[PDB]
């Protein structure tokens, strides 16, 4: 499970993850504090022990590893991705590979969060070498966006490698 939108993900107690804010669709530091899927077992004992699905197909409850104030917030397997630790170099940036990446939507020349995109185009010049991605927010999505921070694109992580 490497590039080309491998589409993986399986997280656990204190397995470091990135997570999407449902409000701007951004990816940031999130430490896992509970993996479970809300079935009180099967038919409601006051316990909430059992998970109906596999450790991949369940629910994840993060504590934002940079933002401790915003507390325990719950996201699903598709809307969390593990802590994207391995850099995608310039040469591996596949057109149509979904990545999470250095962009700010308020100032697109600047650094903000790791917004989720797919490579839409690649180009290089005498002075500058660039990426162009379809960027996705938690509402809208901005096509052929000027990717300035080339050195810190991240991909979908493993489930458990």
């Amino acid at each position: 499970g490497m590039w080309d939108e491998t589409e993986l993900g399986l997280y656990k107690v204190n397995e470091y993850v990135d997570a999407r804010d449902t409000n701007m669709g951004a990816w940031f530091e999130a430490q896992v504090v509970r993996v479970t899927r809300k079935a009180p077992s099967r038919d409601e004992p006051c316990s909430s022990t059992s998970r109906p699905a596999l450790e991949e197909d369940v629910i994840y409850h993060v504590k934002y590893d940079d933002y401790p104030e915003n507390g325990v917030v719950q996201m699903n397997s598709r809307d969390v991705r593990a802590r994207a630790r391995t850099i995608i170099k310039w040469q591996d940036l596949e057109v149509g590979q979904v990545v999470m990446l250095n962009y700010n939507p308020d100032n697109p020349k600047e650094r903000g969060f790791w917004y989720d995109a797919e490579i839409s185009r690649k180009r290089e010049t005498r002075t500058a070498r660039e990426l162009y991605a379809n960027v996705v927010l938690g509402d809208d999505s901005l096509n052929d966006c000027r990717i300035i921070f080339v050195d810190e694109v991240f991909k979908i992580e493993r489930p458990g490698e």
Binding site: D21, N23, M24, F28, E29, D66, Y67, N70, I87, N102, N104, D106, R111, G112, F113, W114, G138, F149, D151, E152
Partner: peptide, 11 residues
């Protein structure tokens, strides 16, 4: 370059 900072919330 090779570094990861966060900024702002809409939350």
């Amino acid at each position: 370059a090779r570094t990861k900072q966060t900024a702002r919330k809409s939350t």
